């Protein structure tokens, strides 16, 4: 039996002996909030397509 | 020297006690008490090293 081999065994992350990982933040250049834009653009359904006929 | 917390000065022995605040409400002042305890601490330190 080696000292470091017996000490550093397979350690299982998570479980009862763990805290939830508090991530810092996503990037503001990555964060676009387009879901709200989709649900806004769903409204006003009487639009006409921007084509030459209209 | 006193205790290791000047939140625990036992207001009687304080250099900002109400008596000396009444003192320093007027100009002049600058009592020779803090310098006296400076000299006493210095003398006791030299005695300790000797």
């Amino acid at each position: 039996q080696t000292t470091t081999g017996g000490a550093h065994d397979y350690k299982y992350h998570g479980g009862l002996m763990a805290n939830p990982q508090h991530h810092k933040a996503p990037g503001h250049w990555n964060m676009h909030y387009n879901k709200d834009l989709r649900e806004k653009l769903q409204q006003r359904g009487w639009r006409k397509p921007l084509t030459m006929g209209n | 020297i006193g205790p290791e917390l000047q939140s625990d000065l036992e207001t009687r022995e304080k250099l900002t006690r109400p008596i000396v605040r009444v003192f320093q409400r007027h100009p002049g002042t600058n009592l020779p008490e803090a310098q006296g305890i400076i000299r006493g601490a210095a003398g006791l330190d030299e005695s300790l090293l000797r």
């Binding site: 039996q1 080696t2 000292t3 470091t4 | -």
Partner: protein, 431 residues
């Protein structure tokens, strides 16, 4: 991957080194055939430091067996663990040594030295990164002394950067076992001083006292003595072969023990040694292991450390143990025996910890002591030298096969200079 080339000269060397090879063989799991039959992969990982891949799972020692006369080498071959050796590593003449230094060194050792250099060159150039050489012999005979010193000199000339360990069992205080051993020991140590990196002086009287007092052992025989010497060899090279918390190889030990190039004669020792019927009365702790290490009766050198000062100490522990306990024990023994250590070097202790103890043991320990008490041994050899050099007894031989008296004078002057230095760094103070 470092390698050690082991050379054994003389009948004493060919017995002790064969026992050493057998001990490390059944420590690494090598069977008498030569194949690996261990259980762990640690025995197989660092195996090239002493062995060579011969046939699949077969490992052969890197031994070089040297003798002027095929004496104990034949018995080593015909004994157990004797066919693991490569058959052409046995280099042998047919004349005798006669316990004569010049026969071993100048006249009859001249015809075998080229063959031994060829064999050890073939062994050494096969290693990718050779570390050093380990010679086992006696400073009392002709083959162990003469051919041994010649081999050390030639190996130093060809490889002047490798670590040279010599064990070289030395003459006893009481009982001689050879009547010309003052001449032999003086002429051998005259070249062991200026050639070897380090030497582990062993006294048979100290071995007998170890067997009698710390091991009972009403019938010791030379097997137990060579076993103890083999245990010390395994203890001083275990950090190459097994991983540990704090490693220390041969070069590290040489750096950490010798303060000056002249002083490299050590006192080996092994712990724990228990009298048969006392293991139930003793309890295994690091403090008792260290106290048995630093006990004066435990070393294999007959000179007493109480008649001297410890220049340096190397403590190589083997076993699952605490570095805090090891360092605290070294600090405790150094502080309590404050008069047995030189004042101008603080912490005269180099520690090492190996994680693999010998089989059947929980903890083992190897003590290497560079002390100023070696001057007792050298003064004894110098006194028994100058007792007969003034009357020229047993010297017509050495004159007959052809050295001059100036060589004997230079050897005794070199011994006296070494005694003077060991006496100087015992009474020299810091400030």
């Amino acid at each position: 991957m470092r390698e050690i080339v082991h050379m054994q000269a003389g009948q004493c060397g060919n017995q002790i080194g064969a026992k050493f090879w057998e001990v490390i063989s059944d420590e690494h799991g090598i069977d008498p055939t030569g194949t690996y039959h261990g259980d762990s992969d640690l025995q197989l990982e660092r195996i090239n430091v002493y062995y060579n891949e011969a046939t699949g799972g077969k490992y052969v020692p890197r031994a070089v067996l040297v003798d002027l006369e095929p004496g104990t080498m034949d018995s080593v071959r015909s004994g157990p663990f004797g066919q693991i050796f490569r058959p052409d590593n046995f280099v042998f003449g047919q004349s005798g040594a006669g316990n004569n230094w010049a026969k071993g060194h100048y006249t009859e050792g001249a015809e075998l030295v080229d063959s031994v250099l060829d064999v050890v060159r073939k062994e050494a150039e096969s290693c990718d990164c050779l570390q050093g050489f380990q010679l086992t012999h006696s400073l009392g005979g002709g083959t162990g002394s003469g051919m041994g010193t010649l081999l050390i000199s030639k190996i130093r000339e060809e490889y002047p950067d490798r670590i040279m360990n010599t064990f070289s069992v030395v003459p006893s205080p009481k009982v001689s076992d050879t009547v010309v051993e003052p001449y032999n020991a003086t002429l051998s140590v005259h070249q062991l001083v200026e050639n070897t990196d380090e030497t582990y002086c062993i006294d048979n009287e100290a071995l007998y006292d170890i067997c009698f007092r710390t091991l009972k052992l009403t019938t010791p025989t030379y097997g137990d003595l060579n076993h103890l010497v083999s245990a010390t060899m395994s203890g001083v090279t275990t950090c190459l072969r097994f991983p540990g918390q704090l490693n220390a190889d041969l070069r590290k030990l040489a750096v950490n023990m010798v303060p000056f190039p002249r002083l490299h004669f050590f006192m080996p020792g092994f712990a724990p040694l228990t009298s048969r019927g006392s293991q139930q009365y003793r309890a295994l702790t690091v403090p008792e292991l260290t106290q048995q290490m630093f006990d004066a009766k435990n070393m294999m050198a007959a000179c007493d450390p109480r008649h001297g000062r410890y220049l340096t100490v190397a403590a190589i522990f083997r076993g699952r143990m605490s570095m805090k306990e090891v360092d605290e024990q070294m600090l405790n023994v150094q502080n309590k025996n404050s008069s047995y250590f030189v004042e101008w070097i603080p912490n005269n202790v180099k520690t090492a910890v190996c994680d693999i103890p010998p089989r059947g043991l929980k903890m083992s320990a190897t003590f290497i002591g560079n002390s100023t008490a070696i001057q007792e041994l050298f003064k004894r050899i110098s006194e028994q030298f100058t007792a007969m050099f003034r009357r020229k007894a047993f010297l017509h031989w050495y004159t007959g096969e052809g050295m001059d008296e100036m060589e004997f004078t230079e050897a005794e002057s070199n011994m006296n200079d070494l005694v003077s230095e060991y006496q100087q760094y015992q009474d020299a103070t810091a400030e």
